[PDB]
From a paper:
Many bacterial and eukaryotic viruses with double-stranded DNA genomes in the realms Duplodnaviria and Varidnaviria encode homologs of cellular RNAPs (collectively denoted “two-barrel RNAPs”). The TMP-fused virion RNAP transcribes pre-early phage genes, including a gene that encodes another, non-virion RNAP, that transcribes early and some middle phage genes. Transcription by vRNAP and nvRNAP is directed by dissimilar AT-rich and GC-rich promoters, respectively, and the two phage RNAPs have distinct overall architectures, with the TMP-fused vRNAP being unusually flat and lacking the clamp domain.
Gp64 is a non-virion RNAP (nvRNAP) that may transcribe phage genes at later stages of infection. Heterologously produced gp64 also extended the RNA component of the scaffold in a template-dependent manner. The crystal structures of gp64 nvRNAP and one of its close homologs (gp62 of phage [name]-26) were also determined at 2.7 Å and 2.4 Å resolution, respectively, and found to be essentially identical. The overall architectures of gp96 vRNAP and gp64 nvRNAP are markedly different. The gp64 nvRNAP structure resembles the structures of other two-barrel RNAPs and has a characteristic crab-claw-like architecture that includes the clamp domain. The non-virion RNAP has a crab-claw-like architecture. Gp64 is distributed along a much larger, 49 kbp region extending from the left end to the middle part of the genome (genes 1-77) and thus interacts not only with early but also with middle phage genes. The pre-early genes include the gene encoding nvRNAP gp64, which transcribes the early and some middle genes of the phage. We therefore propose that these motifs define phage promoters; gp96 vRNAP initiates transcription at the AT-rich promoters, whereas gp64 nvRNAP initiates transcription at the GC-rich promoters.
Author numbering:
A (entry chain B): 4 to 594
B (entry chain A): 3 to 594
Write the structure that this text describes.
Amino acid sequence: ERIGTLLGWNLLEFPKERVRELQSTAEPTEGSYRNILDGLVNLVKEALGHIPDALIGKDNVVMWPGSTGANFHLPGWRVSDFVRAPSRARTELPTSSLTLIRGKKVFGDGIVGIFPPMPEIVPSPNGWAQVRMFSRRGNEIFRAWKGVIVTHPNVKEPLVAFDDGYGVEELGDVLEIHAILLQTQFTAEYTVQGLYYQGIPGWWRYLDLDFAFPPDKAKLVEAGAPLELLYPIAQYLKLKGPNTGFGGILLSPKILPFLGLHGLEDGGLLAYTRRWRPGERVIFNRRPDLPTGQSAVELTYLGLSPIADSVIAHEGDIASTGADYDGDIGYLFPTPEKGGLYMPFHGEALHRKDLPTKDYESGLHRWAGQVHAAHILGRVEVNTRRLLDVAWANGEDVPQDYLHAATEMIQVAVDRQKRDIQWPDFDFKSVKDPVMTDFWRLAVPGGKLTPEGNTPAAKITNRWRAWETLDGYVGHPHMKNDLKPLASKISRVLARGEHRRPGPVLAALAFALLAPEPRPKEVEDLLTAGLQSGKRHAVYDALVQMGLPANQATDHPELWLRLASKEELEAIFKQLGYRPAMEELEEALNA
Amino acid sequence: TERIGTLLGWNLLEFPKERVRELQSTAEPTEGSYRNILDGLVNLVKEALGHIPDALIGKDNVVMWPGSTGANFHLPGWRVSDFVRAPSRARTELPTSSLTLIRGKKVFGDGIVGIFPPMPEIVPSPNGWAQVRMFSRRGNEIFRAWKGVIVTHPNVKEPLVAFDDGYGVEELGDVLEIHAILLQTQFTAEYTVQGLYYQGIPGWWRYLDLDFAFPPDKAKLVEAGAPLELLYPIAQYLKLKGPNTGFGGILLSPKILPFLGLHGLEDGGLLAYTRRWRPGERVIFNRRPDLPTGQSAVELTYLGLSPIADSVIAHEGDIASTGADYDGDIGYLFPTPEKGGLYMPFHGEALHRKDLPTKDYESGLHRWAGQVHAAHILGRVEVNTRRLLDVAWANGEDVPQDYLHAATEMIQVAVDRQKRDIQWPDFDFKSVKDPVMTDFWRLAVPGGKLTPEGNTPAAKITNRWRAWETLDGYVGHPHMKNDLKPLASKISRVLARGEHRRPGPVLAALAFALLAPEPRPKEVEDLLTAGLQSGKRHAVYDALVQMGLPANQATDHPELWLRLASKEELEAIFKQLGYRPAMEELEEALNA
Ligand SMILES: [Mg+2]
Ligand SMILES: [Mg+2]
């Protein structure tokens, strides 16, 4: 459940295709912006007569107080940054508890609290959380903070960075703290964008094929389920790099004295891992990866960070990446000499910070800017990658000027989500043909090797079929040529599982499993509901969640498979003479 | 959830309740009737398995047997019935070598089998209790087993087991496996119809009155000012109540006190985990079932706190007439007559049980037939005795003491026949064919407890409360019938106030007053769709409530919405719809 929600705010969401239709024609102009605002007004007005006061939104989502919800003493537009995020865990401290350290960016630009252990929002005594915090009384909120809270046993008193807050100087009689992201490490893989901007020569030679099964299906695989039950296997394919990095929350060395620790040498970094030794070089990375290559920089690892699951690095060292400490993830990869795929940036970053600023009139205008800028950001990003393909095909490079200009546009597009900045002069150079970037967008949507969430099992085989048609795309000759062995591997895996369908296995299971044990009326009722309405799967998800016993489900093999234990799975597969899926998949990999 | 036996690897089989009820239908206190039931039950099992497995046990419509797989008990087959059927609510394991084995039959009190250091795994309070089954085990063998109550206390340094109250062989396994079958709690302490018939003060019926009991989801509606329409039919939430309530706790022996490092207890006095009485105050002790003589209720002196939570401690000799022991029995304390209690203390103080030839049943199967058969007789004798009181009270007379004694004995043997093959005494049934007040009580207060066992469908509960209109149809004590008239009218006014106040229009109106449903997962859509189309709305809503759907997302299903909404949201919507709170209207009906 969202923050604003728990403050009683209203959440209305639109069909995402409405917003996407609006964005399709967006240009970096005033007239295009205008277009977006108009159509967004239409969506809201159609839904409830007027533009409610203090309304904010992002993409297809809109929220507003009314007077049913809590009230903010900050500009209307600013409040978007506080209401939309999920409250994953909450806690409250009396204003009287608090020590108010003074200075802007005192703990590091984005770190807002430094506290004693707090097992209510932070699992580690020496941990962190990304948070929103509110100084409130009743239904007032006078001052609010967004960013990171650090936790440590050497810290005696809750420290709060006062001047980093938003609102006005007065405080309530509480601090409510919502953790929007709980302490964790982050998967650290190379991305398509990063490989296009800073990848070593011939980086594509080091991509390989892998499988990722959700724990559900991992249990089947481990128990020796047959290939039939993984149909279509494409749903479980992923590319992988030759190694992975470290990923943790990015923190500032400015926190170290507040922990009773010493500072940190220039050019050096700490990280909560023993994978590097003091003295060794590492590649520091922070996303988005920018067209110049400046998102990846070489720094010296100098030892353990005091905070779990974190990277500590100086503002000056990571300025080119555009990083800060309000939730950014810091990734560390091995250097090229040590097997890394990202090359360190050398030289001249655009020294950006302070010039053509200006606020949005209102939450609504801010929302229109976000929606508008989001479209441009993608257009510039994709475009730059297409051009690199066109260039590489010829044997030329895209001029550095362009990469610098594209970068500045990207950075403004991100900025234009917060405030009303002037669009720089940018010539979107056309692209004639399908290029490899178009291929990459099919095969690896979003650019990340670990696929996100949602692709219907119906469409996913088509994605992995694209590897057949490499030769139809303009791009670098060695890239298209050297991808052929990986394309072949992919083809074999698909070919092995094509035509191996689950139907006969589910039918056999129904005959090999004992009669169902006696089950409550609730359960019979749901099961009846599912079958008569053709919504088995909703019913099954329910029953899985409600901890139904395996032996009560044997007349529903699909459901049974989700409740059975290791032992029961192993037994039934042996009884039916199945060859383990994995043996078949290894054979297809290695042929 | 999960029967001990199931966890021991035993097989189980429930049969339709009707197969059993049919055999019981014609049960008589004779060996021939017994053999009827046995032959019937034998058939039941054989239809399923083709044979009666070794070591089968059974109660009512449930049988278990170990088969190829189940734990092997070094105990007579018939005895295992008492260890394998009960629910396993919580479990631990102690190594044999941890235990101190105290010797002597009934050394901790008859029914108490263990005195232990605090054990949060099965007992919530450091000075609490659990009703348990304990098994001395090695691999698949169970050598010795105990049934009864465990007590824990901070003063107890080592786990103490009453070894000689164990059942089976003397060799121990290497683990003592403990299953809690009932967790520490107090128990509702209300007067019953049986208890009032047998021990009630003169005119006890005058002190019964009407009350409401809403389950928490309905109390939420009430407190927020829902309209009477949403309670339809109100009969669902009616109960009778007594003029006062007692204390109910687990019953423990004073023999535990030295083992807790405490001093003993004077004769004639009891301890309980309550401050409601002062040391010195007289109190009425009660143990169920209530027996026809009135001997289930006795006056004892309350002397102070019990060291154990949610418990009552009283002497074997003091409670003998009630037939109580300490293996899980519940002790109830009620105020004396002089202080507004409805139970009179027994003074005729003489049980004196005559000796009836008795021997062990031959097998679990024979014991099962034993309880099935005897459960029927027990029912018949107890109802019948109350009917006889109605007849006598109608004629201005009394049932003779001897009849009460004989009926009590029959009841006791009927209980005992569930354990062992005891001879039936000679008992003249002296049956009653005319409708008597006892028949009214069975309609109005099924089972005799004021707090209804709540498995009557909505469609039938109104008819139950309608029986209050029919008092003239029943022979019994003339003042009982006349004096119940005020209570009957009150019931009548409440039913009539809610009659024709149906929920439909209010549900329809909430659909039009609630905001649009905020966005919801697709599986929630699909579930709701499955419910609508299949006609299983309610199974879906039960699921969605349990999976904790937010109210926000259910506003187009008002029945579901009422189950999810907050106090604030309920109050708000009832105000906007102009409803009068059900409680104001209910109060008006009561007070008219
Ligand atoms: Mg940032
Ligand atoms: Mg007993």
